[PDB]
Design a binder for this molecule. Structure first.
Ligand SMILES: Nc1nc2c(ncn2[C@@H]2O[C@H](COP(=O)(O)OP(=O)(O)NP(=O)(O)O)[C@@H](O)[C@H]2O)c(=O)[nH]1
Ligand SMILES: Nc1nc2c(ncn2[C@@H]2O[C@H](COP(=O)(O)OP(=O)(O)NP(=O)(O)O)[C@@H](O)[C@H]2O)c(=O)[nH]1
Lengths: 359, 168, 169
């Protein structure tokens, strides 16, 4: 980064120290990417590793949030070079510590499986007891691959359980074996209650998965009930996340005809004229996969139908080549008089201050 | 064996929660303003000739997270509600915080202190001491203090008072 | 038996293969990609002269050097590997000044040290003769000399093993 500063990052698990240039103005995820790239892939479950602020002069130890800016956590000036740690995301306990053996018992394969079964069967009060004893909720069921928080997100009216797990020291950004967070998992299940509580408990709606896809992006892939999509956008969720082929949220929504999702995305700032590797806009994908209802929404909301991709095809021409003659008639027939700009400005929650300055 | 005291500092952004807590624990006042996501401080002190372990939670004035805010409230043994004498808005906000603590705790009595910070800046003062005392009286005659993290006025008394109240 | 700590430093001009050498030794991996190094620390347990040794290896910066770091690492370092590229004459020339700086800081003529000619696998690109290295090594109070390839795993282990032997002596 242009304003980048030099930070000494020690990986205790690899017994390595790496001095790296990190962008304070960039988000923590950016900085984490630089550490992992420097590691030459030496870590197992690397995604559940995070940069850690060492305890100093009374101030407690904590993990940097991936979706916060690096400069939001000021560095200690005790060292000549600012020092951060890369560690596995285990529960942060208080200075006061429980018996060493009493832990080894609590965290046996059998005991952990029993604990996950309590969460699965929504036994909130028993879950709370084991957390009070000092069980670390940040682990994976081997067969299932799911952490307790990811399982809790699946259950209906799970707010009770989610609060208890977060109080018991479960990480909100703890990823499952496959790299999804509890926020990803809530959205996939279309569980509005679970998602709202995670956001309420300090969770960011912009948590990235293995491929860097956001929960908003997952909702556009999955379609169905559009409530979770709106809740993420209401939470100032980030827009214009793209996969390897450059598809944005509207691109995926147009392909599977998720018209409610398209409408929410458009309303909250989605760039209609954005194009993927091929140069195709949402309207191009709408023509390719014969999504007449999605196509109408784009056209209605002012989408340019003269846009030509890198094969020099308009959406009209893509439809013709695909065989969707009725859809091409809709696109050719459409006129600027038919376009309706959005009535009113979108509404956002006041859950957290926006990353970066305000004058 | 030492008794643990879990204290929470709540207020609107910029009131001086971090500066108060850091002055108490580290004996440093910082002019620079860095918004607080979340912070925990631990300090050992002697109150009523007894060794006490204070766990102080420094909250974010600017962020709101109701599930987290209720979890701070559920865990906290004692609460310091900080306002700026210079900023009227911060004083106004405290009434709702009071009622939220009582609702979560599910009891009318919770160890608590009303703190008027930035008392060194008399020229900038927009809130009267009487206003604070009047509000404190409304709150079942709750403890009230005017304090300056910069000038080290009433910083130690805030945390000492909370420990006394928890002990009773 | 008691594990002794050995503090080793790898210094050279940019691109000589200090990082590749160190990473081959510690992780047994050769990295084609070139990322300049600010300062990197590796710890590895090895058996030298039938004794278990804890090696602390400092991988230094050839390019974008920091003075305070350089001043620290020379004072703290028990043994030093000065790496040059057989392919790049400039890197060989630069080493003389490094050696004199180490001796000045240490304030003694004898400091555990090895001269390393890296990228010995690239014979076609070779611009520095083995005899030139050996001749330089002789000038340096008969200092140890090696030709090594991080890519082909030639003489990688011997560099660090030799430094430990010298520190023991
Ligand atoms: N003169 C004076 N300045 C103070 C006092 N307390 C805080 N400040 C100043 O006011 C600013 C805000 O301080 P800070 O502790 O960060 O407030 P906060 O409650 O932590 N805010 P936030 O909710 O973002 O964490 C800082 O620039 C600091 O110098 C005080 O008692 N006197
Ligand atoms: N073929 C071959 N390439 C090598 C060998 N050693 C290093 N290289 C290559 O040379 C380049 C520089 O490697 P590197 O070890 O980073 O050099 P450096 O000494 O670390 N330079 P810096 O001072 O900036 O850290 C890399 O692309 C690396 O793959 C070697 O033994 N054989």
């Amino acid at each position: 980064g242009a304003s980048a500063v030099v930070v000494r990052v020690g990986i205790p698990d690899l017994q390595q120290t790496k001095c790296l240039r990190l962008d304070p103005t960039a988000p923590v995820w950016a900085a984490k990417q630089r550490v992992l790239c420097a590691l030459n892939h030496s870590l197992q479950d690397a995604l559940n590793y995070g940069l850690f602020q060492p305890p100093s002069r009374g101030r407690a130890g904590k993990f940097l949030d991936e979706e916060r800016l690096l400069q939001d956590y000021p560095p200690n000036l005790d060292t000549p070079l600012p020092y951060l740690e890369f560690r596995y995301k285990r529960r942060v306990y208080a200075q006061n510590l429980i018996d060493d053996k009493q832990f080894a018992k609590l965290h046996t394969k059998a005991n952990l499986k029993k604990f996950m079964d309590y969460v699965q069967l929504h036994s909130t009060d028993k879950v709370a007891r084991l957390l009070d004893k000092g069980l670390d909720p940040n682990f994976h069921d081997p067969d299932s691959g799911e952490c307790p928080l990811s399982l809790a997100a699946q259950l209906d009216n799970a707010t009770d359980l989610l609060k208890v797990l977060r109080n018991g020291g479960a990480h909100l950004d703890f990823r499952t074996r496959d790299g999804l967070t509890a926020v990803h998992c809530a959205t996939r299940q279309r569980n509005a209650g679970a998602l709202t509580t995670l956001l309420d408990l300090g969770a960011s709606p912009d948590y990235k998965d293995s491929r860097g896809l956001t929960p908003l992006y997952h909702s556009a892939l999955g379609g169905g009930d559009a409530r979770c999509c709106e809740l993420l956008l209401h939470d100032h969720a980030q827009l214009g996340t793209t996969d390897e082929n450059g598809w944005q949220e509207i691109h995926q929504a147009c392909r599977f005809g998720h018209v409610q999702h398209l409408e929410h995305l458009l309303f909250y700032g989605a760039n209609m004229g954005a194009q993927n590797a091929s140069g195709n806009t949402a309207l191009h994908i709408c023509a390719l996969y014969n999504q007449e209802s999605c196509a109408r929404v784009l056209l209605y909301r002012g989408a340019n139908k003269d846009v030509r991709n890198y094969n020099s095809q308009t959406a009209f021409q893509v439809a013709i080549i695909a065989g969707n003659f009725e859809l091409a008639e809709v696109i050719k027939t459409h006129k600027d008089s038919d376009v309706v700009p959005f009535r009113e400005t979108p509404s956002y929650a006041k859950r957290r201050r926006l990353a970066g300055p305000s004058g | 064996h030492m008794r643990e005291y879990k204290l929470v500092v709540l207020g609107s952004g910029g009131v001086g929660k971090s500066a108060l807590t850091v002055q108490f624990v580290q004996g440093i006042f910082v002019e620079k303003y860095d918004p607080t996501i979340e912070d925990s401080y631990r300090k050992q002190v002697e109150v009523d000739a007894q060794q006490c372990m204070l766990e102080i939670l420094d909250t974010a004035g600017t962020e709101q997270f109701t599930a987290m805010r209720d979890l701070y409230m559920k865990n906290g043994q004692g609460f310091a509600l900080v306002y700026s004498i210079t900023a009227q808005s911060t004083f106004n906000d405290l009434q709702d915080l009071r009622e939220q603590i009582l609702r979560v705790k599910d009891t009318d009595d919770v160890p608590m202190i009303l703190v008027g910070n930035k008392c060194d800046l008399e020229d900038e003062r927009v809130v009267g001491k009487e206003q604070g005392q009047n509000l404190a009286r409304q709150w079942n005659n709750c403890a009230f203090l005017e304090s300056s993290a910069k000038s080290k006025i009433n910083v130690n008394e805030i945390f000492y008072d909370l420990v006394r109240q928890i002990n009773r």
